[PDB]
Design a protein around this nucleic acid. Structure first.
Ligand SMILES: Nc1ccn([C@@H]2O[C@H](COP(=O)(O)CP(=O)(O)OP(=O)(O)O)[C@@H](O)[C@H]2O)c(=O)n1
Ligand SMILES: [Cl-]
Ligand SMILES: [Cl-]
Ligand SMILES: [Cl-]
Ligand SMILES: [Mg+2]
Ligand SMILES: [Mg+2]
Ligand code: NA
Ligand code: NA
Length: 327
DNA sequence: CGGCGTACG
DNA sequence: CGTA
DNA sequence: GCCG
């Protein structure tokens, strides 16, 4: 088992679901306390279990696995012996965990904001609604739409959404394309949002595209919220439902076609897969990776990739299709 | 011990 | 600060 | 919390 998530296939469904879920609770709790290192270790340990070919049944099967030390191994031991880990259950029922989870789940609210509200004594969404002077426009939209945004987006919703985005994109710039990325490209059947990557085959033609797209979607009455020169939009969309509609989060990102492989790789995720890939690139290969390119800081050159396959090859990694990037 | 991804709005 |  |  290699130490980086980008070195191993991770399928969407696997054989250690309960164990990985418990470790991810501790990871999330570590994040709520600002402990990014512990969050990373617990996330990595969870991801290792996702990559295993069969269920862990005995503690000895953790021997030699990366990112399993005394703490993660004890969590697993207790789950194997008793079906429950007391530390995990204590986190789950704690007021701190439940409130930080509730608040950071709001669109427009991060750990720092949630923590400040928590220290001020706030605990419920209605607590926030009662004091709306403390809210940004983004947070107001996130709170108003919170119920709908808490409902999973279905893969069966995505196609109709992509069609309306394609229509607006085609008027904004004929020949521009829309590619589904994020979790649905990794095979997820549900998601928290839909992520789309937009480009044009003629380098440079995509400049100034996203304002034109957003203006057209807004004119069609489809935009319940957006932040408005820009290249990423985090918006709330009106999606039809039988006899009504629901609010859905949609992300739109424009890249020049020269950068499209990097943007596709970046936006397809998973989040942990991309952090691990960038860490691998820099620490093992001495190359700096982001959603724009892959930089050699010794030659001061950028790698001109034509595909995701190109990028994996340049990093000395076996290619992983999106469905195996579910770290 | 230091390090822990890297951007844009 | 928020977002991916 | 764990790796190197
Ligand atoms: N911090 C971040 C946040 C995001 N990303 C990248 O953005 C993609 C979509 O994020 P996303 O937030 O839409 C999560 P997704 O994987 O699509 O699942 P969901 O929407 O059903 O929850 C991720 O899969 C990563 O490639 C990242 O690199 N670093
Ligand atoms: Cl930490
Ligand atoms: Cl590609
Ligand atoms: Cl980036
Ligand atoms: Mg998504
Ligand atoms: Mg997204
Ligand atoms: Na949030
Ligand atoms: Na960095």
């Amino acid at each position: 088992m290699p130490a980086y998530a980008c070195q191993r296939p991770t399928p969407l469904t696997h054989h250690n679901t309960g164990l990985s879920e418990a470790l991810e609770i501790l990871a999330e709790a570590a994040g709520f306390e600002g402990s990014e290192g512990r969050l990373l270790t617990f996330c990595r340990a969870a991801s290792v279990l996702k990559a295993l070919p069969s269920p862990v049944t005995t503690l000895s099967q953790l021997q030699g696995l990366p990112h399993f030390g005394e703490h993660s191994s004890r969590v697993v031991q207790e789950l194997l012996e008793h079906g429950v880990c007391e530390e995990v259950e204590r986190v789950r029922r704690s007021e701190r965990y439940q409130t930080m989870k509730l608040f950071t789940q709001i669109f427009g609210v991060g750990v720092k904001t949630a923590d400040r509200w928590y220290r001020e004594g706030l605990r419920t969404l209605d607590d926030l609604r009662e004091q709306p002077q403390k809210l940004t426009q983004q947070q107001k939209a996130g709170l108003q739409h919170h119920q709908d945004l808490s409902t999973p987006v279905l893969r069966s919703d995505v196609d109709a959404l992509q069609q309306v985005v394609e229509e607006a994109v085609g008027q904004a710039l004929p020949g521009a394309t829309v590619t589904l990325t994020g979790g649905f490209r990794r095979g997820k059947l549900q998601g928290h949002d839909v992520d789309f990557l937009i480009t044009h085959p003629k380098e440079g033609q995509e400049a100034g595209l996203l304002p034109r797209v957003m203006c057209r979607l807004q004119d069609q009455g489809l935009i319940l919220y957006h932040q408005h020169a820009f290249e990423r939009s985090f918006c709330i969309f009106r999606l039809p439902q039988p006899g009504s509609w629901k609010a859905v989060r949609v992300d739109l990102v424009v890249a020049p076609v020269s950068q499209f492989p990097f943007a596709l790789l970046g936006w397809t995720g998973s989040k942990l897969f991309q952090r691990e890939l960038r860490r691998f690139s820099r620490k093992e290969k001495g190359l700096w990776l982001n959603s724009h390119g892959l930089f050699d800081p010794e030659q001061k050159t950028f790698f001109q990739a034509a595909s995701e396959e190109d990028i994996f090859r340049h990093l000395g990694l076996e290619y992983l299709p999106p469905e195996q990037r579910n770290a």
